Each structure stands twice: as structure tokens, then as C-alpha cells.
Amino acid sequence: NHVDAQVQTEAPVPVSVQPPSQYDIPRLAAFLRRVEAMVIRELNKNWQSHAFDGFEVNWTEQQQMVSCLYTLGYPPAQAQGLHVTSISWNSTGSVVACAYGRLDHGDWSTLKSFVCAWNLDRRDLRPQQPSAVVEVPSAVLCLAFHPTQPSHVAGGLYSGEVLVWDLSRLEDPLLWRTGLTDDTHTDPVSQVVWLPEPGHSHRFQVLSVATDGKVLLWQGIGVGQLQLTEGFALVMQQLPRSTKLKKHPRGETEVGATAVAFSSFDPRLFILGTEGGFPLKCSLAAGEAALTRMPSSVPLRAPAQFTFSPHGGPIYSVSCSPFHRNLFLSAGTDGHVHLYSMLQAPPLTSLQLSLKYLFAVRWSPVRPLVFAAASGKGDVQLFDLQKSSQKPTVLIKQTQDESPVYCLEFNSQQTQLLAAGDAQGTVKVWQLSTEFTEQGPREAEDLDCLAAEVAA
């Protein structure tokens, strides 16, 4: 007789450093005498040697230009003239996923909305045919993919609900959601991040941020329901502020927000971007109660503990460096991108990238000095801060009619890929030239020197 069996290797155990008194320390000392005699000779030779002056090796083809052939769209969404801004890449690097909703005048979304997923590894990949599709009866605009399970994606809605999909069961692709409760958002949402469960960090929770001026942390239990455990509000008087801001109006008014980026070496620290045009530093441990009129099952608090120098108007994107803990980039309505250190209130650098509106900023997963940005003129741009202090290194025109373009994300594991989305219901995927794809000489040291150059 035949039966079917499933088995899995558990996760690796982490090793620990050992304290010295436990072992025979004189044998470590005798070892270090022998080894230092050689290592002194060999480190002096390696400091001295000419043996690698201009030496190089190759492991990839030297593709000369940022170049592309993909076009991803859902024709039933495109026939309605719907606009797109969402990208996320899954943990297996197999999927890119996208979401349709018109932002055009912020008008009332009783209109149809779709979430689409494309698996770019498929030999059955086609331009006009998503690998999966799910509908929502009001506009969706976020996606974030779970840091381990590749099917699991979370997104926020116009009119305030949060939805979580699992693309591993496509006959029932969607059950983890707020419904509506006192805990919830109300005005348009667009951020998601996935964050580990405190003390149980192999599990994950969904974070949401909204034009409400709330920040919320969520988990799913049972049929059609999420439950909450951290809640913050940007009550306008309460946050500490820089001198470009006047004495603030009624604290019973929030400041609305949409950005999140975490300082990846110390997960308490996150950065927010605001409707008021000022970046904020936020801590997951700020205890000051908000005094918001509205009820919630957990009471709201101020999330923030610092304010940075402002943009010329609303902020729509922020991203933090995966190489230096203190660094973030912001993009907003004023045609500029700014760099900040989390130690200082002025920007470390300011650049103008268009005469028109912008919203994307992302850092390369490979290169400490590469950032990318995208523009309402219909263009995508890449900047190599090791090659120039002032000039953008690459510019790409995505829409032939100059209809607006706004998304950026870099792939999780095929790190040569960058994807961008636009007003003609479409996403395109760009493979970068090799100079972007592989790390340059001394780039980590040059990023430390960049931050140090205006330590003030």
C-alpha cells in the first residue's frame, strides 16, 4: 500500500562566544605566541605587497547599460483607465506584486480595485496575464511581502481597512482583516511593514500608517479578524520640534503621514514622513499618552522623539540605509530629495531631480552609495554617489506619452533588478548595468566618510 509523507529540517541553532576561565588559558597564550610570530610577518608582507595593483577577476557578463524587457498589466483594470502605485518583491525573489487604485483627485473609492502577482521565473509568464489576481470593492494601495513565507502579502485600503492575503490558497486568497473596530484607520492608508513579534521573533505582525496620523501594529486570529497591540498618534502639539515650525494649533488635531523606514541595525528606530512636510524619528517605546478624542482598545501615544528640517510640502517616501545605521533619504512634492543622519536636524545633502513632483526613494541592496528616485514627468533615475557629488548617473523614460510614473523597489535576491509602476495601469522591470550590481572598492568606508564630512 502507498502513503504520502512530508518532512522538514528545523532552523539552525546560533552559536555563542565562550568566556575564557572555563578553558586552559595558557594553551591559548602559547598558541597566540606561535601565531603572532607568523601573523606579524605575514600582515607586514600583505601591507607592503604590490601583488594586486590593478588586479581583477570576473563572475558575470559586463552588461553596459541599464536595460529592460518586461511589461506587466491587467487588461480589465487598464480598460477602466485605473492608476497603479504599489510594488513588493517576495522572500524567494520569484514574485513581483502590484495594486490598482485611482489617487487622481482623492475621489470617493466605491470603484473596483485589484491586486496582481507575477512570478517572473515562470516560462508561462505573459505581459497581459498575472500569475494571480484578487479583487477589492474599494481602492487598495500598499503591498509588503512576509519576510519568510513568499505567498503572504499585506496591504491597506482607501476608507481604512487592512487586508492580508496568502497566495498559497488562491480559491480563498484573503482572510486576515480588520473589519471595522475602534482600533482601526479611517482616512487613506499607504504603508505596510512586517515586524517580528516581541519575544517570539520568528512570528510577524503587520504595521500600518495613514493620513489619519495614526500608527498601528496588528496580528490575525480566527475568521475575518485582526487584533491590535501598539497604537500611536501624531497629535500635533505633543512631538518635539525644530525652529522652522511655529507654536502648533489644537493638539486634538493629528498630522497625517505616509512613510516607514527602519534603521536596520536597531529595530526600535523608525522614520516617518508627514502631510506637514517634516520628517520625524520614532521609537516603538515612546510612552506619552496622545489625548486623541476617539476610542481604541489600546490607548494612543506620541510615536516620535525628533523633528528634521522640512521639505517644501508633503512627504511621500522615506528609506533607510542597510549599511550605515544613521542614514535615511526622503522624497516629496518640492522636486527635491534629501539625505539625513539620525544624529542631526539639517540634511547632510539636498538634490533637485525635476521641475515636477516626485515620489520614490530606495537604496541599492548591494551598493552603499547607490540610490534611485522616480518622477511625475514619466521618468526613473539612479544616482551613484561614489561617481559624482552633484550629477544623476542614469535617467530612464518609462511612459512614451509622459503620463506619471511612481514606484521603486529592488529585488530581494536577484539584486540586479529594479521595478517601477505608472499611471497607464502598468509595471516595468529594469536590469541594471554591472556598475550598479556589484559593490565598488571602499564603498562602506566612503559612506562613513560621507556622513562624517558634515558632522555638525
Binding site: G179, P249, G312, K356
Partner: protein, 286 residues
């Protein structure tokens, strides 16, 4: 020391010279050097070159305003579009970006370029443009002040709410379910908040309606999920399809007909149990 430094400055300026953005950003980065009188006399053609770039930039900013100022909000011929902003809020953000670039153009030219005869002529033009942006923004706020106060008077449309006005209504003339909180009041909370966040003073009457509208906004969004679920499950079914689902819907519809905080939140709690059943059966017909 300045003469040898100015030689290297004039070389660096000649490397960047093709780009007006790089030229202007170098003139900002090294502004305090360019201010000094001997360096200013060494860089005279470079000062006149930046004046020509900035004069053309003031032409382009006014030409963009001349096309846009009576064009449709958000459209490519009119004011630019941000994420989820309204007609008035897009218009204000767009005007302040024109003010910002004209003001920076004036300030940088004032410190660096104000010896030149063309600077007097073009400074007058740039200041006059900047005052015309202020004036046209004030004309939009004068119209907004009238038109918000007249709109708020029509509370029966849902542009403002009496607490003694109706929660939700199954209008037997139509069979449709209606919620008396207008979509324009949800936009008014976004408008008043975004104005406050950027830094505007809010009129007392507008703040009073916003207080009433905030607490009702939580309820109105719940009521609009119910109303859109009822209107969509009705529109999915021609009468040839209804009576079978209508038995399950009659549990949810008893709560809707009972529309004819503690009352409403207990009503919503019962309605969410009915919604688990009805939403499961809605997917089966789809």
C-alpha cells in the same frame, strides 16, 4: 590666496557649466566665496551666465503658471497631482512650489548677482510674479471662505450634521441604502487636517463642524461598508436571482430596517455576526 583659489573655482565652474541645476547648486555650496569682491570680479562672465539661466527660469515659471492658473486641477494642462489631495489642496501645494522656486531664485540672485544692470530689471519681474502668486492664492481663499460657509449651511445634503439627523436610510422610493454623512465631509476632515499640518489658521465654524464630523466619521465609514455591501449585493441580483439569497439577507436586512453611540455600536456588533454569514454566501454566487 583668492586669485589661486578663483583659478580652481573657475575650472570647477567650467566642468559643471552645461547644467543650470549644477551651476546654481555649486553657487549655493560656495556662495560665501562668490560674495567676496575680488572673487566676484574674477567670475563676472560666470555671474552673467547664472543670471541668464535664472532669467530663463523665471520665464519658464511664469509660462507654466500662465497655462496652469485656469486649467483643470490635476490634469496635465493644470496644477499637478499629489497622492489623494483634493482640488483646493492640490492647488495650494502647487502654488507654494512656484512661490518657493521664485523666492529661492530671487534670494540667490540677490546675494550673488545684484551688481548687474539686468538684475534690477529681472528682480522687479520676479518679485512681481511672486506677489501675483500671493494675490491669486488669496483670491482662491476668499472664494473658499464664501463657498465653504454656504456649503456648510446645507446640512440636509450631509455637508454638515445635526446629531439629531438620521444614521442610515433604506429609501423605499429606490430600494437603495443611503448614509447621510456626505463624501465631501470626509474630504473636509482631510482638508482641515492637511491645512492645519502645513500650518493654516482654521476658522471657528469650520473647526466646530470638523469636531462633529470627526466622531461621526468613524461611524460613517462603518455605515458605508454596510451600505455598499447592501447596494452591491442587490445590484449583483436581478429579481430572477433574489429570493434564495433574500432569506439569508433577511437576517442582515432586519438590522437595516431597524434603522427606521451605545445603540449604534450594539447594532454594529450584531450586524458583524450577520456579515460573516452573508459575505460567505455572496462569494458562492460570484
Amino acid at each position: 590666496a583668492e586669485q589661486k583659489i578663483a583659478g580652481k573655482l573657475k575650472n570647477y565652474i567650467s566642468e559643471i557649466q552645461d547644467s543650470p541645476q549644477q551651476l546654481l547648486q555649486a553657487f549655493l555650496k560656495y556662495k560665501e566665496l562668490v560674495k567676496r569682491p575680488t572673487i566676484s570680479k574674477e567670475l563676472m562672465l560666470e555671474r552673467e551666465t547664472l543670471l541668464a539661466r535664472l532669467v530663463d527660469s523665471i520665464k519658464d515659471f511664469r509660462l507654466d503658471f500662465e497655462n496652469r492658473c485656469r486649467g483643470i486641477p490635476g490634469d496635465a494642462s493644470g496644477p499637478l497631482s499629489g497622492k489623494n489631495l483634493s482640488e483646493v489642496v492640490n492647488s495650494i501645494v502647487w502654488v507654494r512650489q512656484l512661490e518657493l522656486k521664485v523666492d529661492d531664485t530671487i534670494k540667490i540672485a540677490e546675494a550673488l548677482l545684484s551688481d548687474l544692470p539686468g538684475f534690477r530689471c529681472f528682480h522687479q519681474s520676479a518679485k512681481d510674479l511672486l506677489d501675483q502668486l500671493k494675490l491669486y492664492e488669496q483670491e482662491q481663499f476668499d472664494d473658499w471662505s464664501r463657498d465653504i460657509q454656504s456649503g456648510l449651511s446645507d446640512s440636509r445634503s450631509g455637508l454638515c450634521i445635526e446629531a439629531s439627523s438620521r444614521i442610515m436610510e433604506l429609501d423605499s422610493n429606490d430600494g437603495l441604502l443611503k448614509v447621510h454623512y456626505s463624501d465631501r465631509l470626509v474630504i473636509l476632515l482631510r482638508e482641515v487636517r492637511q491645512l492645519s499640518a502645513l500650518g493654516f489658521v482654521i476658522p471657528a465654524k469650520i473647526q466646530q463642524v470638523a469636531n462633529i464630523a470627526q466622531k461621526f466619521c468613524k461611524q460613517a465609514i462603518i455605515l458605508k461598508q454596510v451600505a455598499h455591501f447592501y447596494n452591491s449585493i442587490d445590484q449583483q441580483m436581478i429579481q430572477s436571482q433574489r429570493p434564495m439569497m433574500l432569506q439569508s439577507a433577511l437576517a442582515f436586512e432586519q438590522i437595516i430596517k431597524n434603522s427606521k453611540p451605545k445603540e449604534l455600536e450594539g447594532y454594529i456588533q450584531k450586524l458583524q455576526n450577520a456579515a460573516e454569514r452573508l459575505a460567505t454566501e455572496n462569494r458562492k454566487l460570484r
